Amino acid sequence: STEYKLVVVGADGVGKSALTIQLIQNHFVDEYDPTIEDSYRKQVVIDGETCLLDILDTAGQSAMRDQYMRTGEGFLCVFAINNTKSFEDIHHYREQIKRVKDSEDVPMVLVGNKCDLPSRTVDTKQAQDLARSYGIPFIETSAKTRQGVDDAFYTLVREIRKHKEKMSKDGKKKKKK
Ligand SMILES: Nc1nc2c(ncn2[C@@H]2O[C@H](COP(=O)(O)OP(=O)(O)O)[C@@H](O)[C@H]2O)c(=O)[nH]1
Ligand SMILES: c1ccc2[nH]cnc2c1
Ligand SMILES: [Mg+2]
Numbered sequence: 094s095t096e097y098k099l100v101v102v103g104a105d106g107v108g109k110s111a112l113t114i115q116l117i118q119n120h121f122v123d124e125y126d127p128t129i130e131d132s133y134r135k136q137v138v139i140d141g142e143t144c145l146l147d148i149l150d151t152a153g154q155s156a157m158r159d160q161y162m163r164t165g166e167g168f169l170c171v172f173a174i175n176n177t178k179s180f181e182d183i184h185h186y187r188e189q190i191k192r193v194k195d196s197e198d199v200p201m202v203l204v205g206n207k208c209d210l211p212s213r214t215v216d217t218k219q220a221q222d223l224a225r226s227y228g229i230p231f232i233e234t235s236a237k238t239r240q241g242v243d244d245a246f247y248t249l250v251r252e253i254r255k256h257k258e259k260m261s262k263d264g265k266k267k268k269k270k
Contacts, residue, residue: 096145097250100165102186104179105153107171108206111236113150116246121237128152139247146246154182162193167200167253169245172220174205174213174233180220187227198259200252201229204245209235 101109105127114122117133130153135146149161170186172179183203190199203224205215217233224231230248234241261269 094143094145096147097253098164098166099146099148099169099246099249100161100167101148101150101169101171102190103151103171103204104173104176104182107173107176107179108234108236109152109171110150112169112171112204112206112234112242112245113148115236115239115242116148119239121239123237137247139250144250146250148246159193162190167202167249167256169202169204169249171204171206172215173207174215175207175210177214180205180215183223198256200249200256201227202245202249202252203227203229203231204241205231205233206236208233208240209237 101113103109110126110131111122113131113133114120117135131150133146133148133150135148137144137146149165151158151161168186168190170183172183187201190201191197203220205217205220220233221231230252232241232245232248234245236242258270263269
């Protein structure tokens with residue numbers, strides 16, 4: 094019943110596509126194609142509610158980017174736990190989102206992907222601390238094993254819901270419930 098526009102963002106090679114394909118098709122693509130942008134739809138029930146997920150799997154870091162950022166209601170901000178630059182990139186994606194959507198309050202979830210790998214270069218604590226600073230959830234995932242995949246996406250839907258209710262009551266000006 095309720096539709097949610099989700100946008101998966103992050104540096105090339107962090108597993109944005111693999112995560113999305115795991116959610117939709119339930120298999121791991123060890124393959125690759127970092128250039129194209131796919132979108133997928135999925136009907137799921139979350140907390141007893143029927144959700145239509147419309148997910149954009151981005152490719153890159155323009156007059157295409159701005160539109161999809163305006164369209165998106167929530168953002169899955171993905172880095173890979175063995176890719177320091179991709180973790181650092183999160184700051185820049187967040188700033189870009191807040192600017193395009195002209196808001197300090199945008200539903201987001203921080204996702205640390207590839208947690209199946211050894212010798213991570215980005216510690217769980219540093220990612221947890223960042224998420225705490227932003228006031229957003231942090232979820233660790235492996236698109237390879239499928240661990241945390243549903244949780245990441247469902248958590249983002251829950252964040253969007255909380256924002257919806259927060260907006261109606263706002264901080265001041267109007268109030269509601
Ligand atoms: N070990 C491991 N490899 C992954 C994971 N997610 C993606 N990959 C691999 O990382 C490479 C890039 O993944 P891809 O989905 O194309 O990244 P994208 O550019 O962010 O969309 C591919 O070879 C994937 O098979 C993961 O969770 N664990
Ligand atoms: C943003 C979010 C989801 C989308 N699905 C198709 N285009 C999109 C843009
Ligand atoms: Mg991709």
